[PDB]
Design a binder for this molecule. Sequence first.
Ligand SMILES: O=C1O[C@H]([C@@H](O)CO)C(O)=C1O
Ligand SMILES: O=C1O[C@H]([C@@H](O)CO)C(O)=C1O
Lengths: 303, 310
Amino acid sequence: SGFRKMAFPSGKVEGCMVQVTCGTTTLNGLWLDDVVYCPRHVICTSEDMLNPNYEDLLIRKSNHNFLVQAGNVQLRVIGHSMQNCVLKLKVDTANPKTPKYKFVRIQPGQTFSVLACYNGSPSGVYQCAMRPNFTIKGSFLNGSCGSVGFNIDYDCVSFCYMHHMELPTGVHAGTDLEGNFYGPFVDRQTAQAAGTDTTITVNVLAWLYAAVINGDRWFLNRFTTTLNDFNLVAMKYNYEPLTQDHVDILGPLSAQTGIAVLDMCASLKELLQNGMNGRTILGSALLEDEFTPFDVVRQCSGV
Amino acid sequence: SGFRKMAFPSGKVEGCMVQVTCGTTTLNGLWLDDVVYCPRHVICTSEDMLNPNYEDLLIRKSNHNFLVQAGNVQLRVIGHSMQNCVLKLKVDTANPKTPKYKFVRIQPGQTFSVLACYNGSPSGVYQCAMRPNFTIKGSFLNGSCGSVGFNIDYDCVSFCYMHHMELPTGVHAGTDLEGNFYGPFVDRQTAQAAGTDTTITVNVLAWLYAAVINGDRWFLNRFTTTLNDFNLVAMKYNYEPLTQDHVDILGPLSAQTGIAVLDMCASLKELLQNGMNGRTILGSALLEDEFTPFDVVRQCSGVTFQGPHH
Ligand SMILES: O=C1O[C@H]([C@@H](O)CO)C(O)=C1O
Ligand SMILES: O=C1O[C@H]([C@@H](O)CO)C(O)=C1O
């Protein structure tokens, strides 16, 4: 029992983190086989980031301009190419600690673990979710660029995020491991607007189900609601629309607890209108939306 | 910027987790050098946990009754001894992945990362704190016993907790790596009450300091209070007393922010009585108390630890 923001073990990812330096700019790289992936803005200074032209800044660079350090063994760069917003540096040595891995692009609402790194050294691991506006509310300091987000599906490490930027409002943007940003963001220091951030409804319900599995039941009620009847209320409170797909996804949690999805939907709606009245659910005074239904299954059952 | 429940990188500890099976009971063990540490109740069945005598159940076992599996090597047990509530099994092979380690007993209020394990395979890592009532608010399922809690200095893993049981209120109890339980709990299926839990005051102040580092300053005021005057108000709200020691520990955060500890205490006093008035601090509507002053300093300063590339 008990419920925690649980991250995956970071060992398999620790063995892939390297330091990539270009000029006076240093950030982290992902070393899989004989390729090192890192944000392409490693070739920029601070003044450069105001309006960088990556076409030009890369043509001016050679293999010897990239200093890659794995621990403090220096990896020799033998090639370089740009794929969207990530730089791919081929080195002369394959990473002996490369795990079974896969490059995936996640949907908003899905969660993943982040291994925060500085100078290629691990600092901490934590869980977060891809917001509906394609930002993430992470913890990143200067030098953290190139840190990766990942899930471990059984034995395969699914890399899904590479950190690139901190926007002026404090949230963070990045790409998949093919270099395509999540959301409308670009690797330039400029005014960039995110979409309205909304709450991940299906995650709140999954988390409400985790609460009931853990003995928190005070928010259950006797009303019942439907699909259209739930969504008309949800979006006044900036909640994502709940689909029949979601209702199926919550099925296993419904069965484990014996409370139908539409019963639970009536409860949340109630919490939306009246508030929590000084009470708590799973140690929180807010409705948590960064646990997927799968996440609840791992902690309360086991995938 | 940003602030998160950050756990230590778990790589160095992942290489030490093994599966320990005795009879029909399977739980996790910690394999350091040629010794495997695990909870001693691996030798009990459900019928034995009602009122076990571990001296007896252990005398009726010998080395071949303990099956230890590391990955897909079967470790051969060549000795077994009991130290308080942990069982120590010597194996014929030293763990090649042993790091600097240390067995420490932590104080209530201190935090550590837990590597949740099942069948000797790590499943997840999360941060938590030793509650003042010597429980921990963990996340553990059946088979998780033997999971360990730890801190990392730089390359040294300080082991401080081994999981043993879930209390009926859903919280968890365990021992240090010498087998001594934290708190008044015992490894027998019996009536056990944890007791009233209090809020870790010095941790809340550390987290308030983290907030101001991150740009959240709305709770600051012009007042200062005295340790005695703050504690009179705090302890009416089920808060741990704040000592001169605590005030010292917060010194570095005070210097970094330019806010005296007793100034921050004046802010906390207000938040305790009036609430947050529909606002949030670091994305939370509650006062967080599971970040130590040290936890705030490294996360806000980006302290790193030794990776696997020597
Ligand atoms: O999160 C951030 O990303 C950039 C980069 O400098 C970090 O490597 C920055 O300034 C942050 O605060
Ligand atoms: O923490 C726990 O201890 C018991 C034990 O049966 C697991 O081995 C249990 O089910 C937990 O959740």
